[PDB]
Design an enzyme around this catalytic site. Structure first.
Site, PDB file in Angstrom:
ATOM      1  N   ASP A  88      25.751  48.625  38.568  1.00  7.33           N
ATOM      2  CA  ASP A  88      26.474  49.811  38.511  1.00  7.33           C
ATOM      3  C   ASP A  88      27.726  49.330  37.521  1.00  7.33           C
ATOM      4  O   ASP A  88      28.907  49.861  37.769  1.00  7.33           O
ATOM      5  CB  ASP A  88      27.224  50.446  39.820  1.00  7.33           C
ATOM      6  CG  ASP A  88      27.931  51.798  39.523  1.00  7.33           C
ATOM      7  OD1 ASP A  88      27.548  52.373  38.601  1.00  7.33           O
ATOM      8  OD2 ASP A  88      28.681  52.013  40.577  1.00  7.33           O
ATOM      9  N   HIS A 125      36.243  62.562  31.454  1.00  9.42           N
ATOM     10  CA  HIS A 125      35.688  61.170  30.722  1.00  9.42           C
ATOM     11  C   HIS A 125      35.969  61.561  29.436  1.00  9.42           C
ATOM     12  O   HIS A 125      36.476  60.387  28.738  1.00  9.42           O
ATOM     13  CB  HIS A 125      34.238  61.006  30.837  1.00  9.42           C
ATOM     14  CG  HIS A 125      33.871  60.470  32.147  1.00  9.42           C
ATOM     15  ND1 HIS A 125      34.762  59.241  32.742  1.00  9.42           N
ATOM     16  CD2 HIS A 125      32.863  60.748  33.088  1.00  9.42           C
ATOM     17  CE1 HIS A 125      33.769  58.746  33.731  1.00  9.42           C
ATOM     18  NE2 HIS A 125      32.831  59.712  34.183  1.00  9.42           N
ATOM     19  N   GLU A 175      36.224  55.890  36.418  1.00  5.61           N
ATOM     20  CA  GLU A 175      35.355  56.836  37.317  1.00  5.61           C
ATOM     21  C   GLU A 175      36.555  57.770  38.390  1.00  5.61           C
ATOM     22  O   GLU A 175      36.335  58.793  38.534  1.00  5.61           O
ATOM     23  CB  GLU A 175      34.467  56.072  38.259  1.00  5.61           C
ATOM     24  CG  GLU A 175      33.239  56.085  37.661  1.00  5.61           C
ATOM     25  CD  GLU A 175      32.500  57.536  37.531  1.00  5.61           C
ATOM     26  OE1 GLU A 175      32.436  57.917  38.348  1.00  5.61           O
ATOM     27  OE2 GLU A 175      32.344  57.709  36.308  1.00  5.61           O
ATOM     28  N   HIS A 192      30.993  53.355  40.045  1.00  9.03           N
ATOM     29  CA  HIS A 192      31.119  54.164  41.227  1.00  9.03           C
ATOM     30  C   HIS A 192      31.219  53.941  42.379  1.00  9.03           C
ATOM     31  O   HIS A 192      31.293  54.808  43.295  1.00  9.03           O
ATOM     32  CB  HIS A 192      29.490  54.845  41.118  1.00  9.03           C
ATOM     33  CG  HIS A 192      29.559  55.728  39.604  1.00  9.03           C
ATOM     34  ND1 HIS A 192      28.581  55.109  38.437  1.00  9.03           N
ATOM     35  CD2 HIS A 192      29.762  56.849  39.001  1.00  9.03           C
ATOM     36  CE1 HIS A 192      28.647  55.874  37.684  1.00  9.03           C
ATOM     37  NE2 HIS A 192      29.101  56.865  38.002  1.00  9.03           N
ATOM     38  N   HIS A 237      34.835  66.722  36.139  1.00  4.42           N
ATOM     39  CA  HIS A 237      34.537  65.055  36.304  1.00  4.42           C
ATOM     40  C   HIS A 237      34.017  64.593  34.940  1.00  4.42           C
ATOM     41  O   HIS A 237      34.697  63.681  34.131  1.00  4.42           O
ATOM     42  CB  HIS A 237      33.513  64.545  37.426  1.00  4.42           C
ATOM     43  CG  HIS A 237      33.151  63.373  37.434  1.00  4.42           C
ATOM     44  ND1 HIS A 237      33.647  62.466  38.363  1.00  4.42           N
ATOM     45  CD2 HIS A 237      32.368  62.559  36.618  1.00  4.42           C
ATOM     46  CE1 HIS A 237      33.287  61.037  37.949  1.00  4.42           C
ATOM     47  NE2 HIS A 237      32.463  61.288  37.068  1.00  4.42           N
ATOM     48  N   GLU A 238      32.847  65.202  34.454  1.00 10.63           N
ATOM     49  CA  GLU A 238      32.438  64.957  33.164  1.00 10.63           C
ATOM     50  C   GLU A 238      33.412  65.129  31.955  1.00 10.63           C
ATOM     51  O   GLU A 238      33.574  64.216  31.060  1.00 10.63           O
ATOM     52  CB  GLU A 238      31.102  65.482  32.866  1.00 10.63           C
ATOM     53  CG  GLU A 238      30.240  65.231  33.889  1.00 10.63           C
ATOM     54  CD  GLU A 238      29.965  63.535  34.089  1.00 10.63           C
ATOM     55  OE1 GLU A 238      30.112  63.040  33.529  1.00 10.63           O
ATOM     56  OE2 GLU A 238      28.906  63.762  35.253  1.00 10.63           O
TER      57      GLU A 238
HETATM   58 ZN   LIG Z   1      31.683  59.602  35.895  1.00  5.96          ZN
END
Ligand SMILES: [Zn+2]
Ligand SMILES: O[C@@H]1[C@@H](O)[C@H](O)OC[C@H]1O
Ligand SMILES: O[C@@H]1[C@@H](O)[C@H](O)OC[C@H]1O
Ligand SMILES: [Ca+2]
Ligand SMILES: [Ca+2]
Ligand SMILES: [Ca+2]
Ligand SMILES: [Ca+2]
Length: 316
Positions: free
Chosen positions: A226, A146, A166, A231, A142-143
């Site tokens: 957020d 990005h 996201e 998210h 996931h990271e």
């Molecule tokens: Zn993320």
């Protein structure tokens, strides 16, 4: 550092044993020279100054409790690199084999992980809400995704473009989890989230509403928390991606599934060819339809299923 490439052994956050690529020069360093310009894992030493010290070990064995988050951060970065190279012919996150850097033991009791624009950062968790977050392959992927997004579409991290940002990270985090065949599922973070509670996760792609996230555009969050719900509203795109791959009937609209591999090809093409920093949900639909058309033809089942899935979640 300059030195001799070798292979060490250790145990990860969840107690599983694995081999890791290291570099020998007086110490054994968590430096993997076999992938692009290298994968580097650092020790932040419970501080917040980055990146910290390049992880050094005296005997090339990583079985200490303190070692576990570093082992997994290092190993799962390699798996994610392999995924993008083997499946999408992409060399690291910038497409030119940029070095991948991660720091572990960030701060104290820190319940998050993130890409800071230059590297990945992993907290150890508080032991109640999270255990060290590098223990989840979908978290790591996931990271790192990005970074891919930042170097391609550049989706701004707010409102609808941020929710797409996201969702892309959840989608490819999950596809990497399937690629490594590590107890794969359509849940996010289940391996490191709430060690005291079985069967839960941070988010669900199959059923976002399970944890209160919207599964339909009419239920989207419209406030300011957020970053405008990046998210939260990702659940709408996550559900659509799940329906494209697996199929199903959602709010009365039936979707024929086309499988994980075609989902990955379609969304990777949309990410790298058609999305822009300010793309919204409606523009994502157009990008995915065009990408499916490019790859499979305007009259293909694949194009049909993309249209159905976005219809199901109410994105026109
Ligand atoms: Zn993320
Ligand atoms: O055992 C740990 C040690 O390996 C690390 O270097 O510093 C903190 C200790 O808890
Ligand atoms: O040694 C680390 C410890 O500081 C933390 O509390 O839990 C994870 C371990 O890696
Ligand atoms: Ca050691
Ligand atoms: Ca899993
Ligand atoms: Ca998962
Ligand atoms: Ca749990």
């Amino acid at each position: 550092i300059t030195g001799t490439s070798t292979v060490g052994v250790g145990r990860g956050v969840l107690g599983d044993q694995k081999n890791i690529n290291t570099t020998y020069s007086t110490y054994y360093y968590l430096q993997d020279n076999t992938r692009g310009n290298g994968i580097f894992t650092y020790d932040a030493k419970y501080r917040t100054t980055l990146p910290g010290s390049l992880w050094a070990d005296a005997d090339n064995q990583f079985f200490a409790s303190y070692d576990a988050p570093a082992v997994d951060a290092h190993y799962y970065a390699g798996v994610t690199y392999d995924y993008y190279k083997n499946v999408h012919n992409r060399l690291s996150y910038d497409g030119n084999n940029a070095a991948i850097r991660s720091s572990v033991h960030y701060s104290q009791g820190y319940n998050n992980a993130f890409w800071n624009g230059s590297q990945m950062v992993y907290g150890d968790g508080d032991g109640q809400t999270f255990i060290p977050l590098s223990g989840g392959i979908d978290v790591v992927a996931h990271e790192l995704t990005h970074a891919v997004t930042d170097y391609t579409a550049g989706l701004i991290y707010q409102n609808e473009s941020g929710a797409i940002n996201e969702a892309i990270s959840d989608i490819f985090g999950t596809l990497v989890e399937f690629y490594a065949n590590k107890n794969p599922d359509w849940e996010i973070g289940e391996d490191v989230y709430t060690p005291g509670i079985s069967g839960d996760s941070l988010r669900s792609m199959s059923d976002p509403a399970k944890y209160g996230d919207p599964d339909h555009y009419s239920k989207r969050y419209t406030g300011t928390q957020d970053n405008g719900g990046v998210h939260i509203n990702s659940g709408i795109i996550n559900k659509a991606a799940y329906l494209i791959s697996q199929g199903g009937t959602h709010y009365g609209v039936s979707v024929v599934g086309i499988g994980r591999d075609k989902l990955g090809k379609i969304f990777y093409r949309a990410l790298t060819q058609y999305l822009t920093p300010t793309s919204n949900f409606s523009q994502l639909r157009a990008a995915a339809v065009q990408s499916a058309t490019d790859l499979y033809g305007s009259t293909s089942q694949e194009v049909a299923s993309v249209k159905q899935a976005f219809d199901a979640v109410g994105v026109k």
